[PDB]
Amino acid sequence: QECTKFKVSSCRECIESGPGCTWCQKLNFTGPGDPDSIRCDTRPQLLMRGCAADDIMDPTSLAETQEDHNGGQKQLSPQKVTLYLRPGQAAAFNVTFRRAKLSSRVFLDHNALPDTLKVTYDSFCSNGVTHRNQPRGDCDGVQINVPITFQVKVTATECIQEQSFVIRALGFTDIVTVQVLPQCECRCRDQSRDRSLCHGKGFLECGICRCDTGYIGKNCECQTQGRSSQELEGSCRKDNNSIICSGLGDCVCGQCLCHTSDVPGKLIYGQYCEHHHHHH
Ligand SMILES: *[C@@H]1O[C@H](CO)[C@@H](O)[C@H](O)[C@H]1NC(C)=O
Ligand SMILES: *[C@@H]1O[C@H](CO)[C@@H](O)[C@H](O)[C@H]1NC(C)=O
Ligand SMILES: *[C@@H]1O[C@H](CO)[C@@H](O)[C@H](O)[C@H]1NC(C)=O
């Protein structure tokens, strides 16, 4: 899987970036030099970088199905389907058609949808014929008391608003009620059980500390006083066209904290972490 991203600053922005994108809510996951957007990546990349399973945010597209007491509907099942849709990721569910008297050929279709929703049908007919990824369900040679199966795939191009639509077999009063819901929000751990999180001077939002006014840093550890945020950054960059701590460190309250390496011999040092040694 692949994840294309650009300067993502929230869990939702990461999920909206593509079905292959996952978000790491792990505290202090972004080491010195690493921006918040590093938290957004493919799952095996985050796992490699030490993000645990309980810290990887990755909601998926899924289908929930329900049958009524079944005195209500004979030929189409299930009667109720709930879809949670993540943008770009298809949700699949099967609709069973059971012939009573009816028709030799059966078509499965849905009412008009917004352009943000894409629906295709696979047709697993009883006569051996199999259609895949069609705009409609289509099965000829349908016989009484031998069920046929249609696989419905629904894909949203965005975080859609909650809506419903129906799936019907042409020539029949039967209705499959389909409720669709967005799957774009992340269920992250909050601040409730620790007042020391973000030094108690900021809001914890999916691994990111949104520091209170007068506080900066990845953990809101630096109180700025009247010293401006840029003033403390100036002691961390060599010139005005350069990047803070040579992109290899964090500016911790006016001073660069350099990235430490596990690679033997590697040492990142200097006022701006500008010395990259291979033989230390
Ligand atoms: C996160 O890093 C900060 C260092 O600024 C540390 O004080 C805090 O205990 C860390 N939290 C963890 C490891 O959960
Ligand atoms: C639908 O049914 C077909 C054949 O019975 C099966 O191959 C497919 O996995 C089913 N789809 C789902 C989502 O269960
Ligand atoms: C220094 O660089 C910053 C870039 O964020 C810019 O906003 C600022 O105007 C620059 N200062 C001068 C004197 O060029």
Q: Do 279 and 173 share a domain, yes or no?
A: no
H/E segment holding residue 22: strand 22-24
Per DSSP, the three-state class of 270 is coil
Per DSSP, the three-state class of 36 is helix
What resolution (Å)? 1.8
Residue nearest to atom 10 of ligand 2 (CA): 94
Q: Do 249 and 261 share a domain, yes or no?
A: yes
Cα distance between the two ends of the chain: 37
Q: Do 36 and 108 share a domain, yes or no?
A: no
Q: Do 92 and 29 share a domain, yes or no?
A: no
Tell me which method was used to determine the 3D structure: X-ray
Residue nearest to atom 10 of ligand 1 (CA): 28
Pocket mutation for ligand 2, best pick of 97, 149, 154 (most atoms within 8 Å of C-beta): 149
Nearest CA-CA partner of 93 in 20, 168, 150: 150
Residue after which a domain boundary falls, among 27, 61, 95:
61
What CATH number should be reported for the domain holding residue 112?
2.60.40.1510
Q: Do 54 and 159 share a domain, yes or no?
A: no
Pair 138, 126: CB distance under 8 Å: no
Other Cβ atoms within 10 Å of 56 Cβ, number? 17
Nearest CA-CA partner of 75 in 53, 101, 56: 101
Nearest CA-CA partner of 185 in 23, 37, 15: 15
d(CA 64, CA 194): 36
Q: Do 209 and 231 share a domain, yes or no?
A: no
d(CA 162, CA 158): 12
And the tokens for 100?
């009573």
Nearest CA-CA partner of 205 in 11, 4, 75: 11
Token look-up 């945020």 returns: 229
Pocket mutation for ligand 2, best pick of 83, 93, 94 (most atoms within 8 Å of C-beta): 94
Q: Do 72 and 49 share a domain, yes or no?
A: no
Residue after which a domain boundary falls, among 184, 216, 248:
184
Pair 145, 102: CB distance under 8 Å: no
- Helix and strand numbers (H, E) in the chain are 3, 22
H/E segment holding residue 126: none
Q: Do 179 and 236 share a domain, yes or no?
A: no
Q: Do 208 and 264 share a domain, yes or no?
A: no
CA torsion through residues 10, 11, 17, 20, sign: positive
Residue nearest to atom 3 of ligand 1 (CA): 219
Atom of ligand 2 nearest to the CA of 92: 13
- Residue 17 is part of which domain span? 1-61
What Å distances lie between residue 269 and 105, 185, 276, CA to CA?
75, 40, 7
Count of domains observed in the chain: 4
d(CA 23, CA 44): 11
Q: How does strand 148-156 pair with strand 117-124?
A: antiparallel
Q: Do 22 and 12 share a domain, yes or no?
A: yes
Nearest CA-CA partner of 8 in 272, 18, 49: 18
What Å distances lie between residue 201 and 193, 196, 220, 253, CA to CA?
15, 8, 6, 15
Pair 107, 113: CB distance under 8 Å: no
What CATH number should be reported for the domain holding residue 221?
2.10.25.10
Q: Do 67 and 46 share a domain, yes or no?
A: no
Q: Where do the DSSP E strands lie in 135-264? A: 137-139, 148-156, 163-169, 176-182, 202-205, 208-211, 215-216, 222-223, 249-252, 255-258
DSSP tag of 198: G
Name the H helices within the chain.
Answer: 11-15, 43-48, 229-234
Atom of ligand 2 nearest to the CA of 63: 13
Q: Do 72 and 171 share a domain, yes or no?
A: yes
Per DSSP, the three-state class of 129 is coil
